[PDB]
Amino acid sequence: VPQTVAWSAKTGAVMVLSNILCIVAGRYVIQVKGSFAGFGLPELLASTSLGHIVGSGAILGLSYVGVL
């Protein structure tokens, strides 16, 4: 079984970083919707959902490979 870790500040740091990267990426790449004008609740929900998805994937991969 791949090793997973209990919740810590590193896990929070990766998850927060993944959320902030996904918010900026959703700000830049979404075609149909000063820089944060038009930023709505569905776009925030979609970006933060991708942030949780990316953070979960990154946390599991780094816990597998030992970076923790």
Partner 1 sequence: KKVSITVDRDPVATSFEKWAQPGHFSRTLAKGPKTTTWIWNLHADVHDFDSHTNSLEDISRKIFSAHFGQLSIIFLWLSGMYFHGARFSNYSAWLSNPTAVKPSAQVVWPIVGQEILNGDVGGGFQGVQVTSGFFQIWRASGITSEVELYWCALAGLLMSGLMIFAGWFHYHKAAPKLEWFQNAESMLNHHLSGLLGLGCLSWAGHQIHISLPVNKLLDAGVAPQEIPLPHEFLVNRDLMAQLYPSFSKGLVPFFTLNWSEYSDFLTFKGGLNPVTGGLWLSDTAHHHLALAVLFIVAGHMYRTNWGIGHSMKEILEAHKGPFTGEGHKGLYEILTTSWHAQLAINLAMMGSVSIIVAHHMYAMPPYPYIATDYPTQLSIFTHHMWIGGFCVVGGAAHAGIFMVRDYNPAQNYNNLLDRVIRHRDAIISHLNWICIFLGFHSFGLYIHNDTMRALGRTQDMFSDTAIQLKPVFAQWVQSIHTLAPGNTTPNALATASYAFGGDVVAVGNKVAMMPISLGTADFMVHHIHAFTIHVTVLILLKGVLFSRNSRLIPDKANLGFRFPCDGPGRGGTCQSSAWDSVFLGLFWMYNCISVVIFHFSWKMQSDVWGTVQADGTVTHITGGNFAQSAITINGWLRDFLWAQASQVIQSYGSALSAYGLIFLGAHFIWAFSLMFLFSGRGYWQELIESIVWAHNKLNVAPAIQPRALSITQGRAVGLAHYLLGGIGTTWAFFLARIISVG
Residues that bind partner 1 (CB under 8 A): 1-7, 11, 30, 32-33, 40, 42-43, 46, 49, 53, 56, 59-60
Q: Is the CB of residue 63 less than 8 Å from the CB of residue 6?
A: no
Q: Is 52 in the site for ligand CLA (CB under 6 A)?
A: no
Q: Which does 17 bind (CB under 5 to 8 A by kind): partner 1, ligand CLA, none?
A: none
Distances in whole angstroms, Cα of residue 63 to Cα of each of 2, 25, 53, 54, 59: 8, 25, 15, 14, 6
Q: Which residues bind ligand CLA (CB under 6 A)?
A: 2, 53-54, 56-58, 60-62, 64-65
